[PDB]
Structures are given as C-alpha cells and as structure tokens.
C-alpha cells in the first residue's frame, strides 16, 4: 500500500545536491587510476542450449587489478551488432543471470552481464579497512577512496570500454540497463562515460541516501542504519554521509546527456519512490519516468514493453 | 520458543563422524607458519572511560596477511601480574567494540582484550574476495581453505594470545578465552591451535558440524551457506564449499583442545542448533562440562553467567 | 527449512491410486463433449516490440462453448516450426505472460500460452452449483461433471488440436510445458492426448490431493481445507475427494507415453515434495526428475538449462 | 492502532458521488430482468436442537434463473411475526450461519440468512467473461451487466419479496441486517426496495471503492489492486471503476429512506473508517453511526446491545 | 496444519497421573475453607433488550471472602428451569459475555456466566506471594494453597451451590459448560461437586501441564516457560510442577461421574490435541469426544449442534 | 523506522497536564499510609562469584504491609559509599538482575535492585477489585486508591528510606536509575522524595497515557486498550484515565528538583518518543535528554557512557 510522498509531491521533489567541492576531481582521479590498468580482456566459449546465439565468459582487469567477469552473449550472425551492458540487482545474481543475458542476445543485442564485485561474481581486491555492518553497503564507508562502490562504478565504465573495443560491436549503438542496484550502475556509467548512447533504469538504488535511511522500510538501505547503530561516534555518521555523497545519483545525474528511461512503483519499500523521483528530477536530458501505482520493487510487465520499445527505437 | 532438534537423550549421544581431510593438520601448521612470519608490532594507546579502578587502552597488532587487528584492552588499576581474558564477539554483533563489557570484566579482576573480528566489529581484513558469494562473511572465499574468511580470523585469535601473554602485567599462566556463538567458536579454535590459553568458556559455539547445520538451522547466519548454493548451482561448488568448511569446523578442531572447557546450550536455540553444539562438545577429549538450558535459546543466559564467573574465578582469578 | 519426507522416502513414495471404476469412461465422455464443440479458431495480429517474431491473439471454442484465449508467437521465418503450448500458474498470469511467450518464439518455438478459465483470461461458461471456498480449487467440487478443472483440462486438450492444425507448425514436434498448475496441465494434456511429443513440468500441482491437504503449508491446496471448514457435513468431504480423484495426477500419470522431464525443490511449501514425487513415481514412460535441495516453489535457474537442453534434443533437433 | 483520517476529519468526509448518468436506468432495468424470473420458492423442514423455533431450508429463483438458498427459522407461535433477512460476510459463512439464524428467531424474529452466490451457498449461473484476480470482487468487473454483485444485490431484493409474501410474516415489520459485505447488501436492498422498514449495517463493505483500494490494509478490497497488477491496460482501470460505481454505497446511499443504524471501529483495516463514514454521510434519512475507538473488523459487543434495542423498538414492539 | 501426535496415537495417549499422595486431602481442606464462607448472594435486575428473558447481576461470597459476580439470565416463564453455569476463556471475557448468556436463557436455560477472578470480572482477595510471569498462570505457583486457580475452582463450586438454591431452578437439571479455561472449570467443578448432572467442555485447558509446556506453540501455557526463564532455580521448576499437579485435569478427571461431552480440533496450537486427549482418556464415565480435523482453538460450528443436542437430551427434555 | 512526530516537533511537545485538583493530597495521603508501616528491614548474606563485592538479599515492609525484596551489593571496602536504587523493566527481571546489580557495586556504588511487586519478585498484598486485561497495567485501574502502581511508587520511596539509613551508605550521594518502567519509577521516586541526589532514566514509561494508547505500537501500554475492549462502558474509560492521571509522569515531573539525565530512541515503539519528550518537557530542573535516532526500546551503548559519566560526576568523584 502507498506510504511515501503523494504523487503531486514526488513530481516536485528535488533535494539539494550533497556533492562536495572536490566531487569532479575525485572522479577524474578515479578514472585515471582505472586507466592505469590494462584491460587484458579474455573471451572463452560457453556451451548453452540455444540456437542463434553464441555465449562466452568474459573477463577483464579493472581498478585495483581486480579480475571482473560475466557472461557475454552474441547474436549468431554477421555484425556490427547493437550492444548492451546489463547490471544486476544487489545480492540478486544467480548463475550470473545467464538465461536473461541469452534472451537479450536473442532480441538482437550483444549483451554482457557484468557481475558485481563479490556479489554475482568477480574479484574484489580492495581491502576492508575496518568494521562495517553485515553486507556491502558499508564496506570502506569512512573514505571515498576505500568505499565499495568506487571500484564497482569504475568496473561499469571499464565494461563499456571493453565492449566498445570488440569489432563485432557497433560503438554507436550501446545501451546500459539494469534495475535497482543495476539501475544505479547504469546511470553512474552514463554519467561517467559517453560511450553509452541510452540508459534504462528500473527503480534505481543508491540515490538520495540521507532521505533513504529515513524512509525505506526494507534492506539494503537499512545497512547504513545498522552501521551507525554499531559505530555511534557522531563524526562517523558525518563522515559516512560525506563518503556516500560521491556515489549518490542525485549528484551524478547532472552529468547524464544520454536519452534515459526510468520506472518506479509507488508501493516500493526498498527503493522509495521519493529517492527515485529525486534522481530523475536531477536529470537534465532526454528523459521519461514511467509510474506504476500497484507495483513495488519487482518485475513490472508494462515497463518491460516500454523498455523494449525504447531500446529498439534507439539501438535496433 | 519450543523444542525442535534431536531429543535430549539423542543430543547427548550425537557425535558426528569427523570430516577432516588427510591434510587437515598440515594446513594448520602451514597457516600458523605464515602467521609467524608477520611481526606483531603491537601498539597501545590510552582510552578514556568513566570508570575507577580500571585503565583502558586501544590495542592494535599485525596478523596474517599483514592485517591490523584491534580492540579495547582493559586492565585493573592495581599492581599485577593479572590473570587475563581474550573475549571474542558474536557474528555482526559488536557495538562500539563491546567496551562496556570489556571494562566490566576488568572490574572483575581480569586484564581483558576484546578482539574485534575482521570487518565486523572492527579490524582490517586484507584478504581479497576471489569471487561471488552470498550476503555476509560466511561464504567469502569459500572455494579454497587458503582464501576462506575464517582462516585469517582464527589466526588473529591465536595472535591475540601471543600478544597478550608478552605483556609484563599479564600472568602468562592464567589466560582464558571466552565468547558466545561466533565468539565461542573462536575461543575453541584458539585453544585447539594454541597452548597459550589455560581455560575455555564457550556459550553455544557456532562454526560446528556445517553439513548438519545447513539442514537444521532455522535462522541466519548458517543459512548464508544455503543462500550461496542457491546463487551458485554447480554440484562441484557444493562439494568444494563443504571441503573448505571442514578445515574450520569445530568437530575437527575440538580433539586438539587440552584445556578445561565450559560450554552452554539452550534447547530452543534456532541459530546454533543444540545438535551442532553437542557435536562440538562430544568431540572434545578434555576436562569438560556442558550446561543445558531447556527454556533458553541464542541469548544471554543468567544462570550460565554465574557458572561462567565461578569457573573463571576458580581457574584464573583465584 | 527441510520439512517433508526424507529424500530416500520420497524416491519410493507411490501412494495407491484413488481413481474410481468409471475413471476411463469419465474422460472418454468428457472428450466426446469437447469434440461436439467446433473449434472455430480466430487469429489477430498483436504488435509487440521485437524483431524476428510475429505475435497473435488466438481464441477458440472449447467445452461448454467457452471462448479460450492466449498469445501465440511465431518465429518470423520459414517453417514448419516445432511448437510449445505453455500453461501458466494458479492466479499467476500477468498480461498473459506475453513477454515469456515471445521469448520462447525467439528460442525457435511457435508458442501459445493458454490462459486458464477466469484466471489469466478466457471465458468460463460453467455455472457455480453452490457455495465454495474463496478461489477456484473448490468451484463445483461436489461433482466430477461440474468441477473447475474438467473444463480447464479439456481446454488444454483443445489447445493442442488447434496448434496442431497450423500450417507453420510441425505437428510431430509439439511440446507442452508449465510449472505448478501449469505443469499439471502439461501432464494431463499429454495423458489425454497423443498430440504432444514431450512434456516438461516444473513442480506439478493437482497431485495426491489427500496427502496434499495434510502437508501443504501455503495456498492453494489449502482452499480444500477451507471448504471443509465452511461445509462440515462428513459426506461432503467424502464426495469432495471422490470428485478430485478424476483430476489427480497420480491417476492420470499412467497414461503418459511421452518422455517427461520434471523438477522439484525440496523446501517447496506450495507443491510439497511428496506430492510431486507421487506424480513422478506413477509415470511409466521415459522420465527424469531433477531435485533441487535448496529451492522451493520458484524459478530454478539450473532447471532452466535442463529444460532448454531437453526441448532442444526432442524438438528443435 | 489508529491509521485512517482522524475522527473529526472522518465525520466530515463525504466523497463526491461517482454515479454515472445512467445509474438509475441500469437499476430499473436490472430490477425488470429480475421480475421476469418467477420466484417459485420451496420450503423444507430442517431438524435443529432447539425449542420454540422451527427451521427450514428456503430456496427461490432469482436473477439469471439462479437457485438461491439459506436457512429460514421461525418462532414456534402464532404470527404475524416481525422478520429479518440477514446477509453474511465475504467468504465468512460456515454451515449457512444456522446457529445465528436460530438465535435471531429466538429473539422473536422470523429470520432468513440468504446465502451469497458461490460463497456460503446458492447457485451463480452468471458466466465468467474473462480473467480476474482470485476471489469474487473482480469477476465480470469489465461490465456493469456482468459484474458479480449485480446478481447478488438482485438476490437480496428478491429475498425480501419472498419473505414478505409469507403468511406468517408481518410485511410491515421487516428489517435487513448484516456485517461488512452483509452490511452492504442490507443497505443496497433497502436502497433498491421499500420492503424493509429498517436497516442495521455493521461496518459496510463495497463503499467508496476509489479510496478503499488506497487505504485498505487487508483483503478483500485489495483484490481490485491484484486485478490491476495482472491486467495493466490503463483503460481497464478506468473501465473497472466505472463498473464498480454502479454498486458503490456512496451512490446507493441517497436512496435509503429507512431508519438506519451503523457501526464502525476505528482500527478496522478491512473496511477502513473513511469508507464507512463515506457511506453514512451520503445517507439522507433517520440515521445513527456508532463509533468504537478500540475495535476493528469484528464482533462489537456494545453495538449488539444497540442493534437489539434498535430492532426491538422499530419491529418487535 | 497438523503438528501433534497422530490421531491413532492420541486415542492411546493416557499419561500417568501426577497427583501427590495428599491430592484428595488438599481438596477436602479447600472445600472446607470454602464452606466456612457464607455465600450471602445478591440479585439485581439488569436491563437488556430482549423479550422473554429476565437478566440479573448475581454476586456471592467465596473462598478468601472474595465477591464473585456474573450475569444470570432466566427464561421469563414459570419453571422450575433446567440451568447452566457457563465458564469463560482465559482473558477472553467481553462485557461479561452477556449476549451469549441471554441466548442460552432463550434456548430454555437459567444461565449464570461466572466471571473468573480478576479476568472477566470478580474480586480476588488472594495476595501475590512473589514474582511471577506476565499473566495469571504463574500467580502463586510456588504453593498449592496460594495458586491462582485454587480460588477459581472453589468459586466454580460455590456457583453451583448458589444456583442450585434458587427456587426457579431444578437442582437435578444443572449443567456446567465452557471452552478451554472454561471447559477446564466445567470439568473441575464436576469433579469437585456432584451438583451438576452433565458436562460440556470444548478443548479444555489446564491439562497435562508437563507435556503442555513442551508442545504448546502459543499462549497461555507458555507463561509457565516464561516463569522458569525468569526464575532459574532448578528447585523452583520442581515445586512449580508439584503445585500444578493439584489442579491438572489428568488428576481430577477420575472424579467425574457425570455424562461428559468434549471437543478437540487437530490444529489447535493453544490446547494441543494430546493435552486434551490426556484429559479425556482419564475420565471413566459416560463420555464422548468429537474430533475435528480442520479446526483449532476456535468456535466449531458442527460441535455447537452436538452441544445443543446433548444439553437438550439431558436437561431441557428429560430428568 | 521513524514513525512518531518529527524531532523538531518532539522538542516542543508539552501536553497540558491532566492532574486533578486532589493530586497533591492524594500523594500526601498515600505517603502517610506508607509511613504507618514500620520498615523492619532484614539482611541476608548471598554468595556470588565476585571479588571486591559483598552481596545480600534485602527485604523490607512497605505500603499495605507488603514485603519488598531485592539484591543489595556493596563494595568490599570501607565506606561510606555512594548508592543507587535500580529499578527494572516491566516483566523484564530475570533472577533479580543480580549480574547487573553486582556490576554497579564494582563500579563503586552500594546498589539495591528493588523487585517490583509480583514481577521480578516482592509480595503484593493489594486485592484485585475486579476484572482487568491480562497484565499489571490495569489492575485496580478503577480507583486511584487500588491501582497497581500506587503500592509500587510507595515501594520505591521506601527503598530510598531504607538504603539511606544504612551506616555504610552516604545519604547525601544516592541516585535512582532505570529504563522504561524502571525510568518512571526513578522519576516518580525523585518526585515523591528528596532523598535521591540525581536521576537517570532511559526512555521512561507511564507517561502521557492519553497519547500513548493512540501511538504505542507494542505492549504494554496497549494493555489499556485491551482493557477498554473488554469493559465498554464509556464511564469506565473516563474513570480509568482519571486514575491514571495520578501516576502519569507529565504530572509528577514538576516535582523533580534533582539533576536528571534521560534518553530516547526515535524508533522506540514501546515508549514512543513523544511520550518521553512529554515527560522531559515537564521537568524544570538541571536536565538533559540524549536523543538516539537509530535506536529503539533497547540497550543504547552510547548512552551507557553518558550515564556512567553523569553518575561519576554527581556521586563518585
Ligand atoms: Cl571504513
Ligand atoms: Cl517492494
Ligand atoms: Cl571463493
Ligand atoms: Cl534463538
Ligand atoms: Cl459444488
Ligand atoms: Cl515455497
Ligand atoms: Cl470481466
Ligand atoms: Cl481489522
Ligand atoms: Cl509464588
Ligand atoms: Cl489454534
Ligand atoms: Cl478496578
Ligand atoms: Cl522498540
């Protein structure tokens, strides 16, 4: 049932940015550290019961010399092919989401499902500096350089640089997509790299953290609350939100210049409607936000049609 | 709650066959050799706290993987040597380093150090994450005994003991290790791997009889394992994960404990099932005793606190 | 956590059939009532954002002159093509499962997702004879002739005769698939018709009703318990179970001659492992049951690979 | 715990009517179709362990030639007797509610507990046009002519026609009572027929649908939400509410001319206070709404004393 | 869903009695203390919206000089009348259950709904000896003399002695009825007094306490477990069970010689089927137990017909 | 998660007092009845495994000639020592809370953990006048004279008089502390007696009863709601609240003149923030309220440090 701001209110909700003075400098330096790592991608054939598609396990080196992976599925016909980098949900990847990746290739897209560090797969070489609450949301939260998603965002940009380098891929028809965590990486990737032509984000996560901890009624935003319960020093809370600000979609959305499509369910308790309208309302670009009254944080049928139409129009 | 596991008559007879591989002993010898190669380089710094008669410090030391471990150390404000305790905390259950409990132990007469478990209540963990895993620490690096989360943790426990006994104010002959659940497992593991501790006190120890635990536990965190197999369905992965887990399973380490041990179990415990705790207990061959509480689960058990204090006082304080 | 019989007990679980002496006759009669209704199918183009596949809304007349419907998607290329009749779960059809029907066509199969009477769509002309518990499980439960699933099973048989007639369909490479209620429809269709070549049923429902009501921990089997609570006459419980025997998979499984592939998660509280093992253990045909210890009533990734390999082997071959 | 509009806000809550321009015609027309079916009621002796009262099984024909039934209990003494038609809750009728009907007869009332189509009993010859969410709330919801409650409301009116025709019944002393779904049938019956002298409705359901789906926290209003999730077409939502408007109490309330007593508990999560206050505020007749701060959707002891005193005053005496 | 022993097993379940050597002596002593208190009952008319029944608020003095009360409804017609004393469930009495009391009177029974000390009503003079767990279950549990149900059981006996003295009541046609706690009071009263002719007990409580605490999944048997958690002395648990044995139906049942009708739902999580079968299997009288697979601790429609037929046969239309 | 009034609004929440005109005389009368009971305290050595502390079982007579008890632990060194009377939570006392009591003595305070009547221990001689909801909240709620907390508050005052008379106790350095129920007792004790030097109360209970029953989401305030459901006479509700007003912290807080430290967790569903801010805002003394956004009704680690520093400052050093 409804629980967040009213719809009239959500449409006008646009929280002041929390980005620090050194926000762009942090990302410039981060992208430069990523650049210092040679990608050295590898592609190995992977048997799968499907006709018309060739499946591979793709790997590449990213920030911190971490070996990143995921399945890459390509239409079995001569290219150049339109492509997609699909990002998965938080702790929501089973067997690398291989079936859905294959189905995307069947729709006509060379598709790579980047597995998020320590989650669905992929190596995470970044150290754990100290205590944090159960989960990945607060790993390294006391510094923008050590935070879990610094490496993850850089991995998303690297996935795009790798896919763009493949001869069978048309660099002008690449899209990034995903839901919740996947939606945020899609948006973070587009804000950080001009490689992607379009972005589709279902109820994006990692947005408007300061309101999120006070409105969400389910994990994983609440990991932050759990963290502050275990580390009570007021300075810790201050520092954590400062760290979080560098990865917040309301601060990154301004850099997105790609046509963008988003979705939000009004009864979503995991990624509150307000947090998602906040990210949306910070985008200055070709955009559309589809609103579903009776849906939450789940697969939304009607949106799947919208998403397919949007991608087809821009990439097919 | 209500009874759910094997009957009490059956629990007393439950001694599951050991799952230790033929290189179980060599893996630990090797692991300890690697630990030995890291110089402790302990640091101590004064920490203010509103208590009279006890001095508190923040203690740090280097361990396996060149990881900096930390925790609060409280000492009676009187002339030593003092008997000591290394206390280990529960899974994801440390708040502000457990400082109030550590100080209380020092008021009882013990120089106490609450080792903070890597990335949970504190302490650095330099071990990389080799691949995907389920939410939590239970399956981090589970595909190899060399990379498994608890490898470094077990070593940090042993290192804590080596650091504490080197203190001049500590009576090396009167050190005890205590803890509940994850904490009780670390206490038993430290005792199996080190002759330093004199006594062991473990409240419903975790990390025991993993193969039964995944089929009987009804609450987290043993179930992170089940969650890991859901996300990684290759049969070989389940076989490999349990092989890794055997090197850290209390039913395989317990037989190495030579110290008088005090344990407790609540019969309605859904987190560390009675059967899993009796299994660890039944594999010990040492001066021992298991206190059974019919009406308690995974929580503070008042009657056992008295047993615990009387036990530590008997073997250490007095 | 684990809750049903132990794996070793499940493997041998084969409850005695509950079928009455007029069981074969009942279906014979029921199929004759169906044959009396001319299919008169209609096809209409339905736009969908995908390349290489053509979508349609198909309808046809079935038992009780009920108009049955569903989406039908065809690979956009030279046929004939192998085909699949996909059956959806109990009250689990959203927008006719159009997105999944289209994906089956992309895999190379002319696919029709029959919408079950009153659930995902389709008309149900059968009258409600008296009171029943909320839901479809007990509608008309006091007579094999008026029971909800009679019309449904027949509709599934009729779907096969319609698909079979399509010029772009290879009538010799047709499969029936579904999970739970859908898995039961697949097995029942293959038991009542020789049209399907192979069957895939994920944790089938409508199996071993008498044990089901004593072991399920969630809906919908419990609708039967709910019905007995509201209608306490002992003779009602007796009649109710007599009616259900005509639709129980443990009594229909023996007629299946097509190779079959099934799945079961051992922590499934909707279609308990024992009830699924009962249906499987009554099949006498080339069969295989994939067992997943850590899964329940849900999508099982590893079984999707098995499923795709199986259909490819027997159909797309 | 409190969750809806505050009490002072609730007393002032009067949502704008959603009745379409042809609201009145639709009902005059439905009532005409009902009149075409001859009631032809049957009464059969039904044994029950009670002195002073005689019980029967009453049946009659109604809208769509549906055979409606329920128990009829009468005071074992010379009439004319005052009478009551009691309507039951959604999916809440156990063994016809006989015990309560017998108790009402003991209080001096010839009582008939009409059983709602397919729920507590009674036949529903209405066909299911297409797909809908589990339950009766959305059956035939895409059209006012096919909607589940059309036949039910008409059965309610026919119930009154049948009872008043009985010789042992004082046609001038007939009341209609019920809780939730029953509170709504009693209000609808009164709105559609001038047969009842008074109305008692405990927290009536089927009221202010548009707000109900946004405030209800438990079933069954939420079946409408479930329906919209499964049939996403925006015009379907529009169509569904237009259909529902014809049966909504906020639109029927204005036709009730009988003295009316109602009740509402402030923590009711099934029939939210605002939806009940909505119905009450559209009533223009001798009325009274009893508010109970600490009660929910349940038997309210203090209101039973009110309901008995109210019926005693207007009917018995 | 099912959870206890198999029906086959339940029928055979008859736990050995826990009664102490002084079980009978304790009850003799308690009844004698009751006798020392003069009933001094009062009757005040009570307005109610019903025709053909007169209602009163009845009060009387009992054990510990406690004033017990409850509604007493009488059919408005010349008697004598058969009668019923109705006992209510644990913490489950709303406005004295007056509506059900009136209806019983409408079925032809002079009915008294005894309110249980401190719950639905009635005063309770017994002091609280010491700490106990939230609720009435462990109040005064360290001694049979101070235990909460000692006063309540005696109150049920006094109720029968008071109702029987009424002119409009046929003393040879009185029944005791109730569900759970109330079904327990019914049985206990019949065991302690020969005043009632028959007994109707829906899924009776306070039975087989030692098994109860290990099988029950909901309150209030679990208040005992709560009590042990807060008072860990092993000797406290030993004494608690000794105290409870004096009020346990498995020990009292043997004293009942009145025709008795009982009911149990197989999914009852409050009064486990085994605990109810234990009570039933210890009765040696004309008895019947109706078993209902699909019901739990709740109103069972089918058993209401059974209950009404049983009361009619033994009370309204006989003796 | 957050649910009450926002922090800005909580800071200014000060409900109008509900104290009756006879409020002061009621307490004066009560205190005098307590005075007529001679304390006749007893001390008994109690063995416990701890060095540096001697423990005893202390008992004393109080209001209504009830024998109150609890553990008393004293530093094993020459005194006088500062002292604390510790009050426990509602139904939350296990084995007299002896481990915490001993720990306070190790921190340097002669500590007495009073067991509250019938809960953690202690005899309660007051008679139950009639029916009430499960629990202690509504026992004797129909009269200020018979209400459960009357004997309890007096018991607390008597505790202070006994401990202060001990020759090893420095009567000028005594503190009262406790959480929830224990916090209300510490406050009430300080309001009725000038013996305590300071007060520490974690999320105090028994405060702003009229709002509490409309905002609490868990037990035990809801016992009052339960009470009203079982006793529906409007006058009973009126009387219940008049009785409660004599024990409500918003009315007693004005009498506290001791430095006071309080705490509250913003997600506390047992003692809602507004009810605790209500109590705080009525104090006119040296006071501080520590606010913890991410904590509820539980041990707050950060507050323990504040607590210990505050006690050390006023009592130890
Ligand atoms: Cl950090
Ligand atoms: Cl959600
Ligand atoms: Cl790994
Ligand atoms: Cl537990
Ligand atoms: Cl039927
Ligand atoms: Cl499941
Ligand atoms: Cl429709
Ligand atoms: Cl409700
Ligand atoms: Cl006691
Ligand atoms: Cl139950
Ligand atoms: Cl009172
Ligand atoms: Cl809380």
**Tally the helices of chain A: what do you get?**
11
CATH-scheme architecture of chain A: 3-Layer(aba) Sandwich
> Biggest sheet of chain A: strands side by side, in what order?
1-2-3-5-4-6-7-8-9
**Cofactors and ligands:** chloride ion
Overall structural domain count of chain A: 1
CATH superfamily of chain A: Alpha/Beta hydrolase fold, catalytic domain
Following the backbone from N to C, one meets helices and strands of chain A in this order, namely HHEEEEHEHEHEHHHHEHEH
> The CATH topology of chain A, please?
Rossmann fold
The amount of beta strand of chain A, in percent, is 15-25%
Straight-line N-to-C gap of chain A: 38 Å
What is the helix content of chain A? Answer: 25-40%
Query: Which chains make the largest contact?
Result: C-D, 30 and 29 residues
Q: Can you summarize the main beta sheet of chain A?
A: 9 strands, mixed
**Class from helix and strand fractions of chain A:** alpha/beta
Strand count of chain A: 9
Described by the principal axes of the CA atoms, the overall outline of chain A is globular
**Which assembly state applies to the chains in this document?**
homohexamer
Broad CATH class of chain A:
Alpha Beta
Radius of gyration of chain A: 19 Å
EC number (chain A): 3.1.1.6
Active site (chain A): 180, 268, 297
Domain Acetyl xylan esterase (chain A): 1-313
GO molecular function (chain A): acetylesterase activity
């Amino acid at each position: 049932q409804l629980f967040d701001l009213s719809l009239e209110e959500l449409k006008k909700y646009k929280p002041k940015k929390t980005a620090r003075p050194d926000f762009s400098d942090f990302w410039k330096k981060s992208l430069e550290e990523l650049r210092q790592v040679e990608a050295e991608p590898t592609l190995e054939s992977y048997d799968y019961p499907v006709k018309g598609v060739k499946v591979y396990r793709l790997t590449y080196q990213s920030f911190g010399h971490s070996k990143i992976e995921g399945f890459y599925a390509v239409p079995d016909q001569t290219g150049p092919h339109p492509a997609l980098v699909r990002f998965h949900g938080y702790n929501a990847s089973y067997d690398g989401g291989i079936h859905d990746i294959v189905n995307w290739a069947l729709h006509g897209y060379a598709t790579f499902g980047m597995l998020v560090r320590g989650q669905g797969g992929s190596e995470d070489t970044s150290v754990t500096p100290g205590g944090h609450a159960l989960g990945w949301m607060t790993k390294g939260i006391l510094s923008k350089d050590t935070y879990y998603y610094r490496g993850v965002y850089l991995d998303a940009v690297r996935a795009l640089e790798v896919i763009q380098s493949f001869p069978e891929v048309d660099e002008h028809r690449i899209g990034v997509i995903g839901g919740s965590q996947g939606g945020a990486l899609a948006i973070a990737a587009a804000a950080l790299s001009d490689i992607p032509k379009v972005v589709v984000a279902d109820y994006p996560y990692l947005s408007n953290f300061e309101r999120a901890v006070d409105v969400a009624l389910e994990q994983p935003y609440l990991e932050i609350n759990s963290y502050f319960r275990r580390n009570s020093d007021p300075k810790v809370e201050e520092k954590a939100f400062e760290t979080l600000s560098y990865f917040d979609l309301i601060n990154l959305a301004g850099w997105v210049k790609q046509p963008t499509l988003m979705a939000i369910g009004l009864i979503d308790k995991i990624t509150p409607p307000s947090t998602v309208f906040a990210a949306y309302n910070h985008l200055e670009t070709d955009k559309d936000l589809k609103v579903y009254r009776y849906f939450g944080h789940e697969f939304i049928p009607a949106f799947q049609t919208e998403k397919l139409s949007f991608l087809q129009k821009h990439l097919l």
